Amino acid sequence: MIRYLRGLVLKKEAGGFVLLAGGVGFFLQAPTPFLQALEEGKEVGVHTHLLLKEEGLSLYGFPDEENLALFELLLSVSGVGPKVALALLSALPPRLLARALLEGDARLLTSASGVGRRLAERIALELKGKVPPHLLAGEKVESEAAEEAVMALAALGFKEAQARAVVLDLLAQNPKARAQDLIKEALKRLR
Amino acid sequence: MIRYLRGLVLKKEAGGFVLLAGGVGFFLQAPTPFLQALEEGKEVGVHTHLLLKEEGLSLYGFPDEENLALFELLLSVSGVGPKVALALLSALPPRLLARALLEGDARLLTSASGVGRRLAERIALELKGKVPPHL
Amino acid sequence: MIRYLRGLVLKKEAGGFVLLAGGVGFFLQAPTPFLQALEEGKEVGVHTHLLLKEEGLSLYGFPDEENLALFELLLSVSGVGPKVALALLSALPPRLLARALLEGDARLLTSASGVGRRLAERIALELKGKVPPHLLAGEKVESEAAEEAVMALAALGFKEAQARAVVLDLLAQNPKARAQDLIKEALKRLR
Amino acid sequence: MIRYLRGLVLKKEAGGFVLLAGGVGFFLQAPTPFLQALEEGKEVGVHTHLLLKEEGLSLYGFPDEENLALFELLLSVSGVGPKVALALLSALPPRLLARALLEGDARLLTSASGVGRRLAERIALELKGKVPPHL
Amino acid sequence: MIRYLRGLVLKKEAGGFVLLAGGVGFFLQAPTPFLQALEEGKEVGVHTHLLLKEEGLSLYGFPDEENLALFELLLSVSGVGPKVALALLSALPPRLLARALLEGDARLLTSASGVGRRLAERIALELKGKVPPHLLAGEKVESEAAEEAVMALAALGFKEAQARAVVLDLLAQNPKARAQDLIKEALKRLR
Amino acid sequence: MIRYLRGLVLKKEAGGFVLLAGGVGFFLQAPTPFLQALEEGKEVGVHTHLLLKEEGLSLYGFPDEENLALFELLLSVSGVGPKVALALLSALPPRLLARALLEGDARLLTSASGVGRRLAERIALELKGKVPPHL
Amino acid sequence: MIRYLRGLVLKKEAGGFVLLAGGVGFFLQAPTPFLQALEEGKEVGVHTHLLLKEEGLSLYGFPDEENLALFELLLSVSGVGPKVALALLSALPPRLLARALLEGDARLLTSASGVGRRLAERIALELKGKVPPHL
Amino acid sequence: MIRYLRGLVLKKEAGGFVLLAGGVGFFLQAPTPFLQALEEGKEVGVHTHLLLKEEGLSLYGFPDEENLALFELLLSVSGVGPKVALALLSALPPRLLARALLEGDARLLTSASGVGRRLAERIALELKGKVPPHLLAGEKVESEAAEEAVMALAALGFKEAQARAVVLDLLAQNPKARAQDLIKEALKRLR
């Protein structure tokens, strides 16, 4: 239910940390990497993952949707718990873990704290193939293809505005527009 | 306990979406139609249903007392599949469903994915006259 | 955990209603009486009572601490659930129910929707005596014994302030001060 | 998931108190001492511990990582009695407790109400060297 | 595990009875019909059906494999318990119940003590088709097709033995031999 | 499933006894009276009651449909204590019990060990008119 | 607790058979092969395995410490399917199985009915070096 | 329920063995000692102890009531299972274990396979005192105090019968009669 949260890093820890979102001091565990790049006092967003139990409720935080994704997916397997999933996530980088998970590197998995011999195997055979659409490379947008379009246009002659004023109108009739397909199509209406 | 949630759709995504409700990202699964209709980046209120599990909580937002109601009704059978639930609610509009559920139309239900003859067949029977007039 | 909440009465119902506290639309059941004296649109405070389950979580609201108290106490008994406890609370007034519960009117209990024959009995034998400190009469403070003190003083001669200015100083050295014990003790220092 | 709660003490009351945390009245049971010390009507932060049950959630606020820590430690035994837990934490100050727990002093624990010889006796054993130096 | 048992009918009952097999007095419930055709004192065989629980173990007895069969099959359905299954079995004859169960007479099912409206339906939709190989007519062998063969042979001329002495030898080379296919084939070797 | 067991009392012993039933030593707990009356080394039939548990089976032999019946009846309440059960059946004869149970006499039940006022008090209520005439 | 049962095969029948063990008809499911080999009307001893369930007991007789052993081994995985168990034991002889299980041969297991690639695939892994030399 | 059993030792094992009582081959675990003094082929009595579970039923056998006693008592403690209880029983002799258990030798307990450090302690603190009436020395009757009486009498003069014929009559009026109290009391009636 709780997936995202914003608040102060109130106080860190070995494998946990506390987020003062609202007026509530939430306590969530996270991967060492993420955990370290975490500094008390500054606001922060966290991709959380609730988790019931038989004695209480648990919160697990992550740097970005990607991570969260694996953590879940990971928990998806029978036998793998938060600790392990966390280990794996705390050991090798997501991207590399995504691949590994897909392909099935029970070898590479073992190669990481919480190093599970046969477990790394189950987790492997178990998610081979079953992994992942947009998850082999951390989603990251470059530059404003829009502006980027213009910027090109300007340097190609066309007085800025002339170029920007029609790049926009282009993104209108067609929101999807890689600078390329955008830029070109401008030359057309800029003949 | 959550029945209604009104806030920003922080991010549509697949079978669900994230709704911001005052510093807290709530994640709800919801009917494909609704799902697509839903425009991210803006506000929205959605009559929801909080569902607990071995894992933990699971929210389900819908556009009205309407869909919600069918969702909940479908949930009380055996193929309680919120999946199936959502399966059905995604394939047939509330009106056709309610009329189908009620007049027990298995010769339709099957549209939903995952609802073979059997399930639907023994879904209508299970709900024989449980589908409230309000349709 | 959740005991109190403030928000709009978003939408009422047969035996339930929704409280839009925060940005969340919480749905809680309440006693018919309380329920009716409830009007969509106006802010309201609710003495809530969470309740886990095996399929979801449930919220039960109440007019005042008193009620909440019984509702719990009620649930305290083996076999009595929210519905019943609610019935009982929805039927006869708290005060009368508090008494009844104490004394043991399995007769009076039955005498109320959800009218349980032997249940009214269990619930009776079961809480006989086990009920309640400050719960035989809805807690309700009268007038500002403080001011009330003064007000008397003024009408007894003493120019207001003279009287108020020392009633306060009296509540200082001694916060607990029924107008009586307060008033008198003023005449002393007002000789 | 709640570990820290900082807000207005809406109402001290008996074995607990109500803390206002942004439009929501949270209710926490807590150690008698703390409890009395606690002045209602003002602000307060309290390191808490959320405990689930058949019934449902139960919060437990304490004044420090300190008490909290002992509370939690005591909770993991068998006489997991948050009652007993609170029983002990109310009778002996964290220092004496931790030193007692650790050096396993049953010849003390019994002060707490509900902790007969047996329980305490088999509480020290259970925690033999589980009481962390930090005392 | 326990399916069959032999012992005295030690003492009967409303819907139960006790079988003293071994030295143990076993107590099993059975269908009224079967139950009535049961008389204390005489040995008897029972087609039993154990059944664990959360408070004890239960034994359900039946006249013949056929019945037992239905009782189980019956229990096979979700929601139908021993009581109901028993009712159904205690009401209409197996054969007719077998048919009904196959075809799906939620109408005929209801038509019987423990008369379940929608239940008779579930039980119906639920076992439609899923019922039963050799279970539409109580298995019952006629006469010794073997001897029967002979008996015919004798009356057809052939001195008894001559006929019997070769019927046997026929059942040898071929155990499966309806009197017909048996008899004929004798005339051949009796030419 | 065992209701009657008839065989040699291989060994009386404390709160139970061992009965030989064709190469198998069965062990039954039973009412003190019966228990003492019982002469070991000889034969005996005893209407029993097999009770399952977390641990496992538990037999309870009694001298008649009579006692058995009360034993079983008492077992269905909450203080299902076959102990309490046996407690009561050991203190009061079936007749007085049945008449007590039925006319709900708590002013007696207490004789049994372990049955405080409360239990007995809320044992009669629980069985108000459940005690079958046959007394 | 039953490991061996030796008595008359009162009636072969389908996926099981009834064995008479001194006035008591025991019913055991068993491997098809064994099953057919089995001649009804005569005696037989069969190393068994008693399995409890929600329903209740379930016996499983086999012809040797051999098959029994594999049956039991297969039972401890996840697709604990005594069905699958029997499925496998019916398709491959103990020797090939044990050698297959052990050398983890999924490129075979699939013969058994109900054992798709996946199951078998994650049956060998589960038993990697659990298959005892004795083959 | 099952406490005693007689049958052949059909086949032994590492920590188990099979008893063919009736026609059933029962499989029960026992203590190594007991286990070893066990030889396939010979009849034997076993002090058994059933034990349900969530996957099957378990049988644990013992040499004599004494042992069985401890095994149970042992299981009585929270955390100690059949294995451990068995270990303990398989390690040190009952008598010594009975004492130990009473007194509380967490030291001596540890001193035995399944050597539990803190467990030996729990088991200790836990049964200290709570152990055992007639269980500090394996119950074992000497000689027929009766005959023994006589035998003395004869050697003291009195012609055998004369002595035996009145020892019996003595055990009659008084079954409880240590040879001593028996013998003497004979001299009286043999004056």
Q: How far apart are the C-alpha atoms of E95 and E70, rounded to whole Å?
A: 10
Do G122 and A125 lie within an 8 Å CB cutoff?
yes
Which structural domains are found in chain E, ordered by start?
1-63 (2.40.50.140), 64-138 (1.10.150.20), 139-191 (1.10.8.10)
Q: How far apart are the C-alpha atoms of B85 and H46, rounded to whole Å?
A: 58
Q: Token pair for residue A120?
A: 């790394």
Do B121 and E126 lie within an 8 Å CB cutoff?
no
Q: Is F20 helix (H, G, I), strand (E, B) or coil?
A: strand
Say which of D22, D24, D55 has its CB closest to residue C51: D55
Do C10 and B4 lie within an 8 Å CB cutoff?
yes
Which residue stretches of A14-144 are H helix?
32-36, 65-76, 82-91, 94-103, 106-110, 117-127
Say which of F22, F24, F55 has its CB closest to residue H51: F55
| Inter-residue contact C21 to C5 (CB < 8 Å) | yes
Please list every residue in chain G whose beta carbon sits closer than 8 Å to the beta carbon of residue H40: none
For this PDB entry, the determination method is X-ray
This structure's resolution (Å) is 3.3
Q: Give the gyration radius of chain E's Cα atoms.
A: 22
Distance from first CA to last CA of chain A, Å, rounded?
54
Handedness of CA E173, E177, E181, E187 (dihedral sign): positive
| Inter-residue contact F18 to F11 (CB < 8 Å) | yes
The distance of Cα C15 from the centroid of its chain, to the nearest Å, equals 20
Closest CA to E71 of E29, E21, E108: E29
In order, the DSSP letters of G16-64 are: EEEEE-SSEEEEEE--HHHHHH--TTSEEEEEE-----SS---EEEESS
| Inter-residue contact A120 to A110 (CB < 8 Å) | yes
C→D contacts (Cβ < 8 Å), by residue, are 1-7, 21-22, 48, 50-52, 57
| Inter-residue contact B16 to B29 (CB < 8 Å) | yes
- Residue G7, judged by CB atoms within 10 A of its CB (0-12, 13-18, 19+), counts as buried
| Inter-residue contact A7 to B23 (CB < 8 Å) | yes
Query: Tokens 């309740």 label which residue?
Result: C51
Closest CA to C9 of C23, C25, C22: C25
Q: How far apart are the C-alpha atoms of H33 and B94, rounded to whole Å?
A: 73
Classify strands H2-12 and G24-29 as parallel, antiparallel or unpaired: unpaired
What is the least distance, in Å, from the CA of D120 to any CA of chain A? 23
Do E125 and B128 lie within an 8 Å CB cutoff?
no
Element (H or E) spanning D26, and its range?
A: strand D24-29
Say which of F1, F22, F48 has its CB closest to residue E23: F22
Do G10 and E1 lie within an 8 Å CB cutoff?
no
Chain D interface disruption, residue of H119, H123, H126, most D CBs within 10 A? H126
Q: Rounded to the nearest 5°, which phi and psi values hold at A15?
A: -140, 20
- Dihedral in degrees, nearest 10, Cα atoms E179, E185, E188, E191: -20
DSSP code at position B117 = H
Cis peptide before C31 (omega within 30 of 0): no
C→B contacts (Cβ < 8 Å), by residue, are 10-11, 18, 20, 22-28, 50, 52-59
| Inter-residue contact F25 to F82 (CB < 8 Å) | no
What is the least distance, in Å, from the CA of E114 to any CA of chain B? 19
Do C55 and B52 lie within an 8 Å CB cutoff?
yes
F/H touch flag: 3 or more CB pairs below 8 Å:
yes
In order, the DSSP letters of chain C are: -EEEEEEEEEEE-SSEEEEEETTEEEEEE--HHHHHT--TTSEEEEE-B----SS---EE--SSHHHHHHHHHHHHSSS--HHHHHHHHHHS-HHHHHHHHHHT-HHHHHSSSS--HHHHHHHHHHHTTT--SS-SS-----S-HHHHHHHHHHHTSS-HHHHHHHHHHHHHH-S---HHHHHHHHHHHT-
- Tally the C-alpha atoms within 13 A of residue A59's C-alpha that lie toward its C-beta: 21
Do G23 and E1 lie within an 8 Å CB cutoff?
no
Q: Token pair for residue A49?
A: 């993952």
G→H contacts (Cβ < 8 Å), by residue, are 1-7, 21-22, 45, 47-48, 50-52
